[PDB]
Structure 1
Amino acid sequence: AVQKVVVHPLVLLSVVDHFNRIGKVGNQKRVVGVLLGSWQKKVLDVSNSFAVPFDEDDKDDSVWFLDHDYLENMYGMFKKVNARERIVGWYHTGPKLHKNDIAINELMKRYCPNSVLVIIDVKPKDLGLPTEAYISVEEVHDDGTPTSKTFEHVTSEIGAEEAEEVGVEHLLRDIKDTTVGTLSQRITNQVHGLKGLNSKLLDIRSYLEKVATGKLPINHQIIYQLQDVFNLLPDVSLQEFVKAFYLKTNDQMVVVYLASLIRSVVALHNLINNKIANRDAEKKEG
């Protein structure tokens, strides 16, 4: 099926600028549009998209509709100008999908064999790479219930090709690039580490909160198996983990030995040559 999707900055902005379109008039609900995907292989890619006016009542929180004439002739517009582009699904700005979002995909399954819905985020806050990806699939259940659709999460990544790189790479004008080797890896050690702390923290806060409030199910199903997967590896020594310690010490040997070698070479060349050209410039001019 669909493993991972490539979300370019162009489609994300194409939702967010429409969040300015209906956002200046407001008010509630979300920005929904039709997603134009490009499938070269099992890995999915996204290039363009277009948004359609959408309203959803709360009464009746399950009522939703889109304009098919807009989806039809504009697809005829975008397929005309670009024959490689076709609709792989739809999208919305969330932030969290209400249970009614399933039937939208079930309606457009006539257009595409598998429609992947992309939740997006117009205002960056947390925790990381924005948006989200959900693919329409029927997993049934291990409990043998009548088949129901719980959308499986698709990992989303940001990328570009050529011209879409040109625009944004000039538009940054913000932080140093990269710089490779010094600030890069250590700031990533802060972000990936600390955002990994509050991720599982708030996620384990939901683990206990769902047991405290929100039952049923809730708990079951995956709770006992997933939590035991957390209890798979504690994981400490003795024994072989002690061997990995001084083996890792034996690994840092070579690299730091080489470090002292570069120290001697850099100090030799630079210091000797600089003092030469220094003492020479002083004794000749003075």
Structure 2
Amino acid sequence: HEKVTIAPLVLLSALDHYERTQTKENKRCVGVILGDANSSTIRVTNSFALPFEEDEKNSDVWFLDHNYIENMNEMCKKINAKEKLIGWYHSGPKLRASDLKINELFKKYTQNNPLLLIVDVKQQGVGLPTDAYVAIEQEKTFLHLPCTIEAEEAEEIGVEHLLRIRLTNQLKSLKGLQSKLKDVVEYLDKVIHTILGKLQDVFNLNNLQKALTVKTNDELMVIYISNLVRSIIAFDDLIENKIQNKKIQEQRVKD
């Protein structure tokens, strides 16, 4: 599959618009992304904002500015001519049912499949909660793609200036287990379709991990053997330094 990369310039741009647009009472701020989707790795080097207002009790009322789309063409094209509109982004933690109708408005300006980017403004997740989706023909479905961080001279300089293993993964595995656990509890309470089909894929593919235990410990002892021959070398860098430090002490006594 393809890849999606979001620069920290786009990250901080979407996260700052929360307090800039006075977004509260669980609302969203619809932006726009600028990148090159022609390659296999989608990289967004520019982003902007758009005014968005939606009623809480009415999902059929939403405001969008299509005039600002033509305003960035008179600006960005005079600086970077390789910037095009590959889609938009949202500041909400989870998508709603209105995103299906938003794709009809941007399909004329975008020259390719629009990209759906979701950025969590609450920062309540672990790692990179920012996710991306690609709308294709199912009627329509959203194909998720992994999100990475852009590494370039135009970003890491500003990141290092403002700012300056398994234990982290343990908290990440709990998020995947509790997500499926709470989904079953909410399902049984509201009743007594794609999740039920893919749910048993994990159960039939951790009692099954105990059959290879005989072959698992075969390569585990090699790790300790590699550490045993390395442990002897560890003393070679120590005792040798003790001999050198002893010769330094003999010169300090004569002083």
Q: TM-score if structure 1 supplies the norm length?
A: 0.81
1:202 to 164, 173, 178: 178
Within-5 A mapping of 1:1-286? 3-23=2-22, 26=24, 28-39=26-37, 41-112=39-110, 113-139=112-138, 148-173=139-164, 188-196=165-173, 198-215=174-191, 220-232=193-205, 234-238=207-211, 240-263=212-235, 265-282=236-253, 284-285=254-255
Pick the structure with more strand per residue.
Answer: 2
| Distance in 2 separating the partners of 1:21 and 1:271 | 61
- Tell me the percent identity: 43
Question: Please, what is the CA RMSD of the aligned residues?
Answer: 2.2
SS at match of 1:89: strand
Say whether the 8 Å CA contact 2:92–2:121 is kept in structure 1: no
* Alignment check: 8 A CA contact 1:11 1:46 kept: yes
For residues 64-99 of structure 1, give each alpha carbon's deviation from its aligned partner in whole angstroms, at most 9, with x where no partner exists: 231111111223321222101111101111111111
Q: TM-score, normalised by structure 2?
A: 0.90
> 1:105–1:117: 8 Å Cα contact kept in structure 2?
no
The answer (yes or no) to whether the contact 1:93–1:121 under 8 Å persists in 2 is yes
Give deviations 1:168-224, integer Å, cap 9, x for gaps: 111112xxxxxxxxxxxxxx211112221x2123113224224313449xxx44414
Which runs of 5 or more structure 1 residues have no equivalent in the other structure?
140-147, 174-187
How far, CA to CA, are the matches of 1:207 and 1:51 in structure 2?
33
Name the amino acid aligned to 2:203: F
Give how far 1:279 is off. 2.4
State the number of aligned residues: 254
CA 1:86–1:215: 2 relative to 1, 3 Å: farther
Higher relative contact order (CA 8 A, sep 6+): 2
Matched-pair contact (CA < 8 Å) for 1:138–1:150: yes
Could you tell me which runs of 5 or more consecutive residues in structure 2 were left unpaired when the two chains were aligned.
none
C-alpha change, 1:75 and 1:210, in structure 2 (3 Å) is farther
Partner secondary structure for residue 92 of structure 2: coil
